[PDB]
Design an enzyme around this catalytic site. Sequence first.
Site, short mmCIF file in Angstrom:
data_model
loop_
_atom_site.label_atom_id
_atom_site.label_comp_id
_atom_site.label_asym_id
_atom_site.label_seq_id
_atom_site.Cartn_x
_atom_site.Cartn_y
_atom_site.Cartn_z
N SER B 9 0.75 -1.10 -0.15
CA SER B 9 0.09 -0.02 0.04
C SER B 9 1.00 1.32 -0.01
O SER B 9 1.53 1.52 1.17
CB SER B 9 -1.14 0.00 1.39
OG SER B 9 -1.69 1.21 1.55
N1 LIG Z 1 -6.44 8.35 2.15
C1 LIG Z 1 -5.95 7.41 2.89
C2 LIG Z 1 -6.10 6.11 1.57
C3 LIG Z 1 -5.70 4.47 2.23
C4 LIG Z 1 -6.51 3.61 1.69
O1 LIG Z 1 -7.36 3.79 0.64
N2 LIG Z 1 -6.34 2.11 1.93
C5 LIG Z 1 -6.69 1.14 1.41
C6 LIG Z 1 -5.64 0.05 1.15
S1 LIG Z 1 -4.67 0.39 -0.32
O2 LIG Z 1 -5.16 0.92 -1.49
O3 LIG Z 1 -3.64 1.73 0.23
O4 LIG Z 1 -3.41 -0.79 -0.39
C7 LIG Z 1 -7.51 0.54 2.36
O5 LIG Z 1 -7.40 0.38 3.58
N3 LIG Z 1 -8.75 0.03 1.85
C8 LIG Z 1 -9.62 -0.71 2.86
C9 LIG Z 1 -11.07 -0.23 2.47
O6 LIG Z 1 -11.22 0.84 1.72
O7 LIG Z 1 -11.88 -0.51 3.01
C10 LIG Z 1 -4.62 7.26 3.32
O8 LIG Z 1 -3.93 8.04 2.79
O9 LIG Z 1 -4.36 6.66 4.58
#
Ligand SMILES: N[C@@H](CCC(=O)N[C@@H](CS(=O)(=O)O)C(=O)NCC(=O)O)C(=O)O
Lengths: 208, 209
Positions: B9
């Site tokens: 991520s």
């Molecule tokens: N804006 C957030 C985005 C983080 C995000 O979208 N995380 C995703 C995973 S990843 O795409 O970064 O791998 C998540 O936890 N998704 C779980 C969900 O949306 O339920 C940040 O900067 O922390």
Amino acid sequence: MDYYYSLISPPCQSAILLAKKLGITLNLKKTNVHDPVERDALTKLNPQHTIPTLVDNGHVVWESYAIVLYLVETYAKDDTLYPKDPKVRSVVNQRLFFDIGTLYKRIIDVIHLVMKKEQPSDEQMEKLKGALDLLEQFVTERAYAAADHLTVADICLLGTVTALNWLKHDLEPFPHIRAWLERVRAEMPDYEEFSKQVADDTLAYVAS
Amino acid sequence: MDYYYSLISPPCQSAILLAKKLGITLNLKKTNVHDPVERDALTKLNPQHTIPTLVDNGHVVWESYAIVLYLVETYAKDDTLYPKDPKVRSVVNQRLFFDIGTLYKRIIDVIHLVMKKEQPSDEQMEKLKGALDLLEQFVTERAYAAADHLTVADICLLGTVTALNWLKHDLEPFPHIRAWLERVRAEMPDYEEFSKQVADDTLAYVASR
Ligand SMILES: N[C@@H](CCC(=O)N[C@@H](CS(=O)(=O)O)C(=O)NCC(=O)O)C(=O)O
Ligand SMILES: N[C@@H](CCC(=O)N[C@@H](CS(=O)(=O)O)C(=O)NCC(=O)O)C(=O)O
């Protein structure tokens, strides 16, 4: 200070409300980001050429969230709107990045489409409704967006939620959000006047 | 402090790098936000259940940007990574909102499509380019993302740009970004090792398939 904007622009509303709150006086300058002549001059200041865009003492700031935080640090007589306690501020910040990256994002997408006059997938609404669910919770734990009192998170989130006006979104399922809206607008000076123009201007944009 | 995350991520890599730069011990907790059992668990701490998610002495924090700014304010012996002067901090803040809402938004949008075996429209690839030209300009007016020295802006944008690797997106046309990349990584403690740790994890993850 100069402020390039458009009252119909949700993000453009944040600083406007903030200025009145702090009693700051802005030199409004209506901007048409589609005018090749206006884009240039704006670009000379902000290369991404987007509104809002603040110019204070010659210092340029763009991105509503960056404008709002700059104003508070630079003109607020207190830190109530952006607390220094890292344990409180992180809640404000989380909500600010929640605003631009989650809530308003999904709202703006449906609006953009709705203007194009095209059906939003039966799943975009999910993320939309899902965004609101989160906000419903935030304003359940506390009476304000990211604290037990009004912060710049409330001002930004207010613009995004009242923007649900373009689309017709029933707020009935979200009582707390309703209670929260009334409470936050009840603290915004000159709000009613602001609400009229914004409300009337949109229908004028819809007139087309 | 606990740090629910996954090196695959891009958002999660910000707090990791920052942590190294400031000597903060992070009790890592590899999290598969797709696993329902883990998903439900995370939710209890973060109703949005997204990683990265930090938990410092019970104080929960999410959004890579909120976590970043929190750690610096709380543990940074200096304010160089996040200058107090409103004249400087406005640029950092702006560049951060540029990241989440402009550059990374347009990158991940493309990746999400390629993941669903779909194709980006010409418009999408154009905004992608548009965001890069901007970043390109940013790193020309100064050696760093938002100032005359490294800040939290550089760390977050570094995560975002290397994420372009999944799309084999050509950065040849972006000279200053390439230069800027070397500068920042040369300033991240044991970068090559981090990068290799990412590689290993991504392989170990794709192995889960
Ligand atoms: N804006 C957030 C985005 C983080 C995000 O979208 N995380 C995703 C995973 S990843 O795409 O970064 O791998 C998540 O936890 N998704 C779980 C969900 O949306 O339920 C940040 O900067 O922390
Ligand atoms: N994240 C930005 C979003 C601003 C934005 O998208 N502005 C639009 C106008 S509006 O949709 O808000 O009305 C713009 O300037 N568009 C012109 C351009 O992008 O060149 C902010 O919060 O300031």
